[PDB]
Structure 1
Amino acid sequence: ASVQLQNVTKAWGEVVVSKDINLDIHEGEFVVFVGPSGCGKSTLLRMIAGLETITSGDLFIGEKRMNDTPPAERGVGMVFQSYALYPHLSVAENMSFGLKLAGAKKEVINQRVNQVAEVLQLAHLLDRKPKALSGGQRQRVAIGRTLVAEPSVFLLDEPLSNLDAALRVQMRIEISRLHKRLGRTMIYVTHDQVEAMTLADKIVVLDAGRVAQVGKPLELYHYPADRFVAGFIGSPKMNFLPVKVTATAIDQVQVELPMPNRQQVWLPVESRDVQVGANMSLGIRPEHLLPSDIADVILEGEVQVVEQLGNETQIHIQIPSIRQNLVYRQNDVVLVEEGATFAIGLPPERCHLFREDGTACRRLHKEPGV
């Protein structure tokens, strides 16, 4: 029920694809592993599942060590990336398979199946074969199968990753309502920061087999640990500006803009272990950017792209002195042409800062939600 890892390490001979990493997951917590493809998300899930041996470290599920325990006896259950349905078996048989073997109970099965078929709308597909169903339905058969088994820990390997974008959105919600309807531990693997932010109680961001940061979604959004976490969470990517540190106070820090107009501004952030002349990256999210007539920190350039989204408007701007189109994000509709000059405001309080290595400086700007 309560899964926890201690210095878990997986290596294929010499190549270490997962440095000694620890994760503290609590009873019923909704946990999501995010990161780029191959970053080990599935490895970790499969290691918890027991589908992959743990080379080094210790693994506890229900507070007992599981390293050497067969997968079927870990009180766990998994939804596979490919649904992993039995082609030759009907939906009913596909779902009941689990307990169908060893412990055959005719009358008990019919129940559990119908019960989960009710909450997932699969009662009219119980006779059908995983070939006569749609990716959406086949995806519900996968979840249903593990729901019937009633495992203590749920393991899901990118369940929505292969569905229409519209169904995906809809299925995110259905999951959350399945989560609190059961209140059991769920481990959710995905590459979509949207899926992490919206489902996860606790989020585990992985960077090439290494944990970058752990915590609540809203915590990871405002206060990232390093440049990667920052650059991975959020609809449009966070803007990174090459800056040079100039002044150093205990309260805050100051950096220099790469423009011909060498402007300077103080940033309410950590000032421990910082030096003047260090080339750093300035972090600011498009949504937090302001209109020009408000803030006194002006940034003017040329509009390259105009993405009208209806609910909002996204604008990419070529700032003279940075080969990175500065991106702006506002509400409703912004009547602006492609190529016409445009200026925005830079809020110093809403800024992040990263060292040479990429490690972020603890933001001293209190944010709502933490």
Structure 2
Amino acid sequence: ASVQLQNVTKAWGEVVVSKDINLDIHEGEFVVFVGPSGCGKSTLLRMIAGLETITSGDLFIGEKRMNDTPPAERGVGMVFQSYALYPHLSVAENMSFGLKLAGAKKEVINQRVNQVAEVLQLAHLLDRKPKALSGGQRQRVAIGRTLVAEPSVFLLDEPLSNLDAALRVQMRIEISRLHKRLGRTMIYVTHDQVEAMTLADKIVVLDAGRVAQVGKPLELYHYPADRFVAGFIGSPKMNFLPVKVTATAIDQVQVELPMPNRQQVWLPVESRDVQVGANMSLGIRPEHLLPSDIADVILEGEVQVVEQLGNETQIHIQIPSIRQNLVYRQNDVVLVEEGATFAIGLPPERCHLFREDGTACRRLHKEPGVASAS
């Protein structure tokens, strides 16, 4: 139902957990806050819910400033970690609970419970106390509540945390579908980049309380704004090679690889604030390294680890030119033994470049799936 944060800031004493954050969440939008451990995801949700105060800035749900408004009068529903049910209430009861304080026709009440039930996989245990173990089921009960009561805005704090990988996976699809049906605004929080990529219309990456970047999944993936975002989004982390810039041009930067071979390569990157001799970080995703049959900039090394996963093979390589190890991903099964000498290709159009301050030199290579000029 439209949520806006304007220069919102949170301070506990003299520390700042949330620094001047500006976010514009539109109606029906599914937004995900992503970031490491204590980057401040929960604090944000809490400030939006009113379970925490906004030391500065304005919060705006719908069209009204909610800063000073009781949590129950904001039009938000929330679910988190390992939510606790009302022990005396049954699953069905612990599910129609919130939709009840909101006053609702039993027809609706039941309609929703049963719907949400046969989705979160619970219809068979509506009649039963929260001592339905499994915790993974109680958590599902916790979520259903918020789902059955359809708050104008959903605030879910790591809802899938207590589930098995298999369940966690099905739940995502379920939450996605759920979002397609009812088109309400939802702010979701995880520490798992995959959930983000999978659920969001818009992702907001948090780093130590600051907003590192905001944008569509593919935007964050093809064009991370800085090293932090670049190493946070991407199942197996992006590779980073320390390089030295040896030349610049318009819409093009040349750097030399740490290889005692010091091969120089031109990268179709921004070239803005970048001077010759500067030390930078070259970034290349494991999926984007090439088989090697494709010459032009080759890296050869010793296999340290080989992960056969059936659908793909992840190979860890030790490139003589400074340890690092380089992680490579090739599709399907690849037969290589540890200790073997493996080579791969470095594709310029696919590289990222970060200045010492960690900021990125905007990539000029057009990537599919992202609105681009031309």
TM-score w.r.t. structure 1 length? 0.96
**Long gaps (5+) in structure 2:** none
Aligned CA distance change for structure 1 residues 327 and 99 (closer, same or farther; 3 Å)? closer
1:10 corresponds in structure 2 to: 10
Give RMSD over aligned pairs: 1.5
What SS does the corresponding residue of 2:186 show, helix, strand or coil? strand
- Which stretch shifts more, 312-321 or 138-147? 138-147
**Offset at 1:124?**
2.4
**Offset at 1:83?**
2.1
- The one-character-per-residue Cα deviations of 1:257-276 (angstroms, maximum 9, x if unpaired) are 11111100100010111101
**Offset at 1:163?**
1.1
Aligned CA distance change for structure 1 residues 108 and 252 (closer, same or farther; 3 Å)? closer
Contact 2:82–2:161 (8 Å) recurs in 1: no
Q: Separation in 1 of the partners of 2:72 and 2:11?
A: 23
- The one-character-per-residue Cα deviations of 1:10-37 (angstroms, maximum 9, x if unpaired) are 0012111111110011000010011111
What SS does the corresponding residue of 1:291 show, helix, strand or coil? coil
Aligned CA distance change for structure 1 residues 105 and 182 (closer, same or farther; 3 Å)? closer
What SS does the corresponding residue of 2:64 show, helix, strand or coil? coil
Aligned CA distance change for structure 1 residues 268 and 94 (closer, same or farther; 3 Å)? same
Aligned CA distance change for structure 1 residues 104 and 165 (closer, same or farther; 3 Å)? closer
What SS does the corresponding residue of 2:65 show, helix, strand or coil? coil
**Offset at 1:140?**
2.1
**Offset at 1:96?**
2.3
Contact 2:92–2:126 (8 Å) recurs in 1: yes
- Which stretch shifts more, 96-105 or 32-41? 96-105
Q: Separation in 1 of the partners of 2:106 and 2:215?
A: 44
Q: Separation in 2 of the partners of 1:37 and 1:5?
A: 22
1:104 corresponds in structure 2 to: 104
**Offset at 1:119?**
4.3
Contact 2:95–2:113 (8 Å) recurs in 1: yes
2:135 corresponds in structure 1 to: 135
Contact 2:132–2:138 (8 Å) recurs in 1: no
Q: Separation in 1 of the partners of 2:117 and 2:164?
A: 22
**Offset at 1:46?**
1.0
How many residues are matched? 370
What SS does the corresponding residue of 2:92 show, helix, strand or coil? helix
- Which stretch shifts more, 70-79 or 98-107? 98-107
Aligned CA distance change for structure 1 residues 106 and 161 (closer, same or farther; 3 Å)? closer
Contact 1:81–1:157 (8 Å) recurs in 2: yes
Q: Separation in 2 of the partners of 1:367 and 1:212?
A: 21
Q: Identity rate of aligned residues, in percent?
A: 100
Q: Separation in 2 of the partners of 1:111 and 1:167?
A: 24
- The one-character-per-residue Cα deviations of 1:126-146 (angstroms, maximum 9, x if unpaired) are 221112242332222112101
- The one-character-per-residue Cα deviations of 1:231-274 (angstroms, maximum 9, x if unpaired) are 00001100000000010101300001111111001000101111
Aligned CA distance change for structure 1 residues 123 and 254 (closer, same or farther; 3 Å)? same
**Long gaps (5+) in structure 1:** none
What SS does the corresponding residue of 1:314 show, helix, strand or coil? strand
Q: Separation in 2 of the partners of 1:345 and 1:174?
A: 40
What SS does the corresponding residue of 1:195 show, helix, strand or coil? helix
Matched, 1:234 2:234: yes
TM-score w.r.t. structure 2 length? 0.95
Q: Separation in 1 of the partners of 2:167 and 2:220?
A: 26
